[PDB]
Amino acid sequence: ALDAAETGHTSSVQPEDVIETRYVQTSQTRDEMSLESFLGRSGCIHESKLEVTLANYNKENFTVWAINLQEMAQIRRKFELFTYTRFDSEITLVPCISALSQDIGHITMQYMYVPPGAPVPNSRDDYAWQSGTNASVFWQHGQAYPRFSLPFLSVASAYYMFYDGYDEQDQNYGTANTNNMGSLCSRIVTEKHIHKVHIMTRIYHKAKHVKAWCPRPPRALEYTRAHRTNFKIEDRSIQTAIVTRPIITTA
Amino acid sequence: QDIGHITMQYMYVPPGAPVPNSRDDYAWQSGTNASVFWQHGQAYPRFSLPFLSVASAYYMFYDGYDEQDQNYGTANTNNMGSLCSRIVTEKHIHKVHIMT
Amino acid sequence: GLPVFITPGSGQFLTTDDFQSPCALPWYHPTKEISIPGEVKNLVEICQVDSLVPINNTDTYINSENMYSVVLQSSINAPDKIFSIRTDVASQPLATTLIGEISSYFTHWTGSLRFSFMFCGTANTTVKLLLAYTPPGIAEPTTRKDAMLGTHVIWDVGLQSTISMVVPWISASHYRNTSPGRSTSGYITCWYQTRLVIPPQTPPTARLLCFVSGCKDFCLRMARDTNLHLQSGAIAQ
Amino acid sequence: GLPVFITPGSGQFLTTDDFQSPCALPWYHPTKEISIPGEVKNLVEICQVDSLVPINNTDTYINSENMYSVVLQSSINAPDKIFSIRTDVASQPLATTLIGEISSYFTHWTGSLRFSFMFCGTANTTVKLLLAYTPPGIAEPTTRKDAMLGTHVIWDVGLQSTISMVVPWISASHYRNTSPGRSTSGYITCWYQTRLVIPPQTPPTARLLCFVSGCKDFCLRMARDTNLHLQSGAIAQ
Amino acid sequence: RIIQITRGDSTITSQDVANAIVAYGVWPHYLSSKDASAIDKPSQPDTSSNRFYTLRSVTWSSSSKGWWWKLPDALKDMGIFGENMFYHYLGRSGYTIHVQCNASKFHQGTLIVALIPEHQIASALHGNVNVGYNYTHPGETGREVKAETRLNPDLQPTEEYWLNFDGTLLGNITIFPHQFINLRSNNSATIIAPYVNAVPMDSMRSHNNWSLVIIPICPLETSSAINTIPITISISPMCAEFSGARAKRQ
Amino acid sequence: RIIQITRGDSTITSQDVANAIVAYGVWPHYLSSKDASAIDKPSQPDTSSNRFYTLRSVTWSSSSKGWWWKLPDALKDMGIFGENMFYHYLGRSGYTIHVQCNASKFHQGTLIVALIPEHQIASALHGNVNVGYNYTHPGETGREVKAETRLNPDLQPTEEYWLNFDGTLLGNITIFPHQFINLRSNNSATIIAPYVNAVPMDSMRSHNNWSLVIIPICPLETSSAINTIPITISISPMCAEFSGARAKRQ
């Protein structure tokens, strides 16, 4: 029952030591507690909101987003739990059309994974919508939710959840160095039409076939700056998840 | 005069999940909560839900309390939490009722 | 084609589904898994880690190390209470421990908890102390003898640094809910079994640090997006 | 993909369907079935339970125990009728029995019914009584001898408490409909086979209680949302 | 039709009774290592508490309407059983019950006795109300049923016995393990039950894991000047067990 | 509770210490032909650099708040190790670390030492800011934590030690391989680690592939006039390797 916690090792391990127990079939599975469970449930990642511009329909009606797990808190906190992690990815698209007009008609929408050094589309009419080898995929009104399996991408063994330095000329400290996945993209595929509409895609992912590397403590406070671990918010104070009580002798 | 395309969310909210307060609440994100979608023209959604209870079986009745003595009977034992629903399409002109 | 017909539950997306899916990136191949140290398979190994309670959760200590610590008074001839806490894994302050957060990510819990305690005072100093647990349905104790009727340990503060002990699992149900609303799991409570005795002109003071972890007994169910943390608005970048 | 083509009956929901379905909650595991007493597999074991008829369904008894009971008059030198009932399982009052309700949850029934009767009067008291059944297509009897032409039992009220007897299944069809509209299954009918005799200065009265259950013969089909109970509006909470 | 009964230290008989049906045929037993939740080796008072104890005299008349109890609360004061219950967060026990109800050869009337599960009693009043602890837990004092003026009525249970106090029909009550005191048939009646719950053991004082009902299905009478008879009930707990020892519960 | 230590040419002891947990149990080793990325046979200085080196004296008080280092940068000046690092684009090494912290039998207070991974430090200031190289790479000079006036604050890391300088709770920090200097328990503390990265070897000067933290969890005191004690740390690199030789890095 006595130990040296200062060893770093966990303390006196055994429950039968200080209770005169009856034998019990303690027989409760840890399988929900598995990584292929806890990481392996999907969640939303990012919010591709767009307005269909009329005045230059051909120019404006596309978006691009830098791929990261760092700007929706729940998913972020799953991964902000380790040094590194590796997984294959279910990716799932929840496209939504919102009408600013009496109807929407038929609408079709493009997505593209833009790995870095693909030519980024500049225009809803850009030749970059052609995609001989880029993973590009389509959705339209009344179609089911699109999904794809994306394998583990990194040039390294695992994604950096954190990093402790720079790209070699010393800026962008941390994940903004290592985590250059490039970007997702979206664009209306139907040609110019009269209906003023917003398209919103909620994009979801689940990590499966997962592996993870050296656990690290959970985030204590609101996020702030995607790649950066910054937490001291402007004109604000560090109101953590800990809550105070009047006296330590009162539960 | 029309409905257009409409999409709708459901979530099982087990107790101590953060309950959505708003149609824009971050709680619509659902990394592990069972959340599911329907939209106009889609077939009827279904899922298999396994037997849930912390005990062997659901109490159809109960003969006492949560330990400080109110809510007599099933209102003690039968805390499954809640189902939830929410329109997923963004703001649009059609006044509509959704009934599930 | 084969005659087929379609069941309900088709055409939805469920964030907690389970299926095969087609590849976005066929013919690709991942980088090899080098033997990185620090393997993991489950959350329970994190549960096995002792983490400090911020036991001393008040204004005068919160913005500092000191909320992990308590101060003892060698001046006092008394049997009386040093501190007490709940035992419900997602209650304050315990929720803020890493087992707390992992439990806060979950709805059901089971199995006994390990607790541990170091006499952080001057090496020359002696005491023996009562660490005790209260089986609930009852108020938190108000005499040392009350806690002596509970399950408890008296700490022989020998050469060895730490006493470690367990709240036995005494839930009626095999699990309990991880966060209580209008509900309770019992109390930790701490008392002067002897007075604390420093030798003369030692600092008139001592420190204690307190640890918890899951025992081999411990487990969870109903992973849920945790109580413990909030996002307001957009996360900027 | 495989060439497939779609039959009608696709894309509906039927509240009485039968299929596999995908999980909302994969990797979950249920609590173990401890050996709780009071197992059940079928409704027929409930049918096997004797339950009281509220035989005496009138204003003067309904809001009380007394509608389960009948009162007998030891003062009477007569052969005459004590009571009578239908035999159609979902008819009043029989429907209100638990076999009644289970039958009311169903559209078809078959097999013979058990009926049982206790002489609840003073232990010192004697009688013998006629319990009889009427095969239908005919009026409910108006003399004891009419019932004596029906299938019947004469109760030797010995030391033993209860007479028990069966309406034989004599439906033309292997089943009958559980509720008759403009239809009939036959009658139970009850008569003074002797006069009831108390010994002197006993209470000038006696009680009888009446029971029914499914025999080993009994069965049902076409489970239907029962006649017996109504919901008006929303069920508040 | 004769029996003798022996539990823990104490013994019972009737020489005019028909044997108990054992509830669901399951003779009482301790928990199993295969099914248990609690970790300790639990408290077996054995003979010192799996023994009989009995309730204060009720008495009945043609005018009487019914009586019931909820267990273990009805036995909270039964020495060893009572305190061993109050000092633990959890326990479990079955019961052997016999009801004592002799009359003369010259009486008529009948009671139904039903052992009954959670028996979740309905309120007296309508609307947004529920039963208060004092009444769900009447102790050994029990709940006789009466015509009038029970205070705090909003928190009282209903008196409606023929609706089984829950809005279910009497006479179907024979769905549970049951017997009749019928003064011709017997002079006493008996029932025995194992432990039961959705859980392998339970918070004794917080939940009446069993309940017992006795109802005047047929009115008591005799011509004799002894116009009324007492009833009393004796119970032994069975395989009684307790776990999570701490202070005495309030 | 006694140890002796011997690496490359140099030796260490405490006769009041409890042994290091080896980080994740993986005793340090060279790269494998099965896992490697770099093509050359790499630089093994062996004994001449897998040997101890030690940092300038810090010293602490009841008023003190914390200290940390980032590796390999904290050792850039350790002769053979330092230059062999600076002359290669890549390398890898684990570490053996011991922290030296004796007091009298008549002192109290405690430090936690945590070995920590990429430990991606948060800015001091809010908003669109990040940490500048001079501060992420403090060299052997390290980062003690102080109350006041650190210039270029927009590029400074936060001083918020109990938020682990990254917005995570202290006390959960025991998730990493760690020890306590507790003046009763020990007079010194020790930890050893293999190499680690998402990559089989790494750009040493460009990325602190490991980091080390020491925190005054409990305030230093004694009644003696010696109101303060130094701390010092010694490190040996382990299995140290370097690849892509060219000029000295600036």
* DSSP letter for each residue of A131-200: -SSS-EEEEETTPPPPEEEE----SSSSEES--SB-BTTTBS-SHHHHT---EEEEEE-S-S-S--EEEE
Region at A226 (left for phi over 0; alpha for psi -120 to 50; beta for the rest): left
Tokens 């509720």 — which residue? D179
The alpha helices in A14-108, defined as continuous H runs, are: 35-38, 57-60, 73-79
Residues paired with residue C42 on neighbouring β-strands, in sequence order = A34
Method of structure determination: cryo-EM
List the structure tokens of E90: 């959890």
The identity of residue D119, as a single letter, is F
Task: Give the closest-approach CA distance of E247 to chain C in angstroms.
Answer: 6
Q: Are A13 and C215 in contact (CB under 8 A)?
A: yes
Instruction: Give the CATH number of the domain where residue C60 resides.
Output: 2.60.120.20
Q: Are F87 and F113 in contact (CB under 8 A)?
A: no
Which one, of F98, F50, F68, lies nearest residue F238 by Cα? Answer: F50
Angle (nearest 5°) at CA C175 between C174 and C181: 140
Phi then psi for residue D11, to 5 deg, are 70, -5
Helix then strand then coil, in percent of chain B rounded to 5, is 5, 20, 70
Inter-CA distances, D140 with D89, D146, D177, D191, Å: 17, 9, 20, 13
**Closest residue of chain C to E92, computed from CA coordinates:** C172
List the structure tokens of B48: 């298999």
CB pairs under 8 A between C and E: 54
Gap between the Cα atoms of C128 and E25, Å rounded? 55
Which one, of E54, E59, E127, lies nearest residue E97 by Cα? Answer: E54
Q: Are F190 and F17 in contact (CB under 8 A)?
A: yes
Tell me the chain C residues in contact with residue D23 when contact means C-beta distances shorter than 8 Å: 17-18
Resolution in A: 7.1
Region at D11 (left for phi over 0; alpha for psi -120 to 50; beta for the rest): left
Rg (CA), chain E: 18
Long-range pairs, A118-125, Cβ under 8 A, ≥24: A118/A182, A120/A64, A120/A183, A120/A185, A121/A62, A121/A64, A121/A185, A121/A187, A123/A58, A123/A59, A123/A62, A124/A57, A124/A58, A124/A59, A124/A60, A124/A61, A124/A62, A124/A187, A124/A188, A125/A58, A125/A59
Residues in Cβ contact with C234 at an 8 Å cutoff, skipping those fewer than 6 apart: A71
**Residues counted in chain E:** 250
DSSP annotation of D37 reads S
When scoring F184, F222, F229 by the number of chain C Cβ atoms within 10 A, the one with the most, hence best to mutate, is F184
Nearest CB neighbour to C98, from listed F26, F172, F184: F172
Tell me the chain B residues in contact with residue A98 when contact means C-beta distances shorter than 8 Å: 89-92
Gap between the Cα atoms of A173 and F134, Å rounded? 12
Gap between the Cα atoms of E27 and E21, Å rounded? 10
Q: Are A199 and B89 in contact (CB under 8 A)?
A: no
CB atoms within 10 A of CB D96: 20
DSSP A203-230: EEEEEEEEEEEEE-PPB-S---BTTB--
Q: Are F169 and C96 in contact (CB under 8 A)?
A: yes
Tell me the chain E residues in contact with residue D198 when contact means C-beta distances shorter than 8 Å: none
For E9-18, letters b (16+ CB in 10 Å) and e give eeebebeebb
Q: Are D103 and D109 in contact (CB under 8 A)?
A: yes
List the structure tokens of F25: 């149990």
Tokens 């309390």 — which residue? B65
DSSP A225-245: BTTB-----TT-----S----
Q: Are A11 and A3 in contact (CB under 8 A)?
A: yes
> Which helix H or strand E contains D210, and what residues bound it?
strand D206-214
Q: Are A151 and C30 in contact (CB under 8 A)?
A: yes
Gap between the Cα atoms of B62 and B73, Å rounded? 4
Q: Hey, are the CB atoms on B30 and A38 less than 8 Å from each other?
A: no
Gap between the Cα atoms of C149 and C144, Å rounded? 9
Tell me the chain E residues in contact with residue D68 when contact means C-beta distances shorter than 8 Å: 170-171, 217
Gap between the Cα atoms of C222 and C109, Å rounded? 9
Gap between the Cα atoms of E16 and E3, Å rounded? 8
E75 touches chain C (CB under 8 A): no
List the structure tokens of E62: 């043609």
DSSP D52-94: E--TT-STTTTTSGGGGEEEE-TT-----EEEEEE--TTSTTG
Gap between the Cα atoms of A30 and A15, Å rounded? 18
Gap between the Cα atoms of D155 and E40, Å rounded? 59
Tokens 């053996």 — which residue? F96
The identity of residue A20, as a single letter, is E
Q: Name all chains with 3 or more CB-CB pairs below 8 Å to chain F.
A: A, C
DSSP annotation of E68 reads E
Show the domain range for D234: 1-237
Tokens 């000038």 — which residue? D204
Which one, of E172, E28, E25, E23, lies nearest residue E112 by Cα? Answer: E172
Which one, of F226, F209, F238, lies nearest residue F90 by Cα? Answer: F209
CB atoms within 10 A of CB D200: 6
Gap between the Cα atoms of F130 and A176, Å rounded? 10
List the structure tokens of F104: 């009298």
> Which helix H or strand E contains F116, and what residues bound it?
strand F107-116
Burial category of C19 from C-beta neighbours within 10 Å (exposed 0-12, middle 13-18, buried 19 and up): exposed
Inter-CA distances, A53 with A188, A194, B94, D130, E37, Å: 11, 10, 21, 93, 63
C180 touches chain B (CB under 8 A): no
Chains B and E touch (3+ CB pairs under 8 A): yes
Q: How many domains does chain D have?
A: 1
The alpha helices in chain E, defined as continuous H runs, are: 80-87, 133-136
CB atoms within 10 A of CB C124: 16
SS3 state of residue F110 = strand
The identity of residue A233, as a single letter, is I
Q: Are A16 and A23 in contact (CB under 8 A)?
A: no
**Chain B residues whose C-beta sits inside 8 Å of any chain A C-beta:** 1-2, 4-5, 7, 26, 28-32, 37, 39-42, 88-94
Q: How is the beta sheet containing C81-86 ordered, strand by strand?
A: C81-86, C187-191, C128-134, C151-156
SS3 state of residue D120 = coil
SS3 state of residue C121 = coil
Task: Give the closest-approach CA distance of A34 to chain E in angstroms.
Answer: 23
Nearest CB neighbour to B12, from listed D24, D29, D31: D24
**Residues counted in chain A:** 251
Rg (CA), chain C: 24
Gap between the Cα atoms of C56 and A249, Å rounded? 10
Tell me the chain C residues in contact with residue D13 when contact means C-beta distances shorter than 8 Å: 8
Q: Hey, are the CB atoms on E130 and B62 less than 8 Å from each other?
A: no
Gap between the Cα atoms of E162 and C54, Å rounded? 58
Tokens 């990815």 — which residue? A89
CB atoms within 10 A of CB E244: 28
Dihedral sign of CA atoms E129, E134, E139, E141 in order: negative
Dihedral sign of CA atoms E27, E33, E39, E40 in order: positive
DSSP A133-152: SS-EEEEETTPPPPEEEE--
Chain breaks in chain E (C to N over 2.5 A) after: none
SS3 state of residue F81 = helix
Gap between the Cα atoms of D224 and D144, Å rounded? 39
Tokens 């059944």 — which residue? D133
Gap between the Cα atoms of B36 and B8, Å rounded? 9
Inter-CA distances, E191 with E31, E67, E231, Å: 21, 16, 16
The identity of residue A206, as a single letter, is K
Gap between the Cα atoms of E140 and D105, Å rounded? 40
Tell me the chain C residues in contact with residue D15 when contact means C-beta distances shorter than 8 Å: none
List the structure tokens of B35: 């959340």
Say how many CA atoms lie within 13 Å of E28 toward its Cβ.
20
Q: Are C132 and C205 in contact (CB under 8 A)?
A: no
Helix/strand/coil (H, E, C) string of D145-187? HHHHHCEEEEEECCCCCEEEEEECCCCCCCCEECCCCCCCCCE
F102 touches chain C (CB under 8 A): no
**Residues counted in chain B:** 100
CB pairs under 8 A between C and D: 48
Residues in Cβ contact with C148 at an 8 Å cutoff, skipping those fewer than 6 apart: C130, C132
Please confirm whether the linkage preceding C93 is cis (ω < 30° from 0).
yes
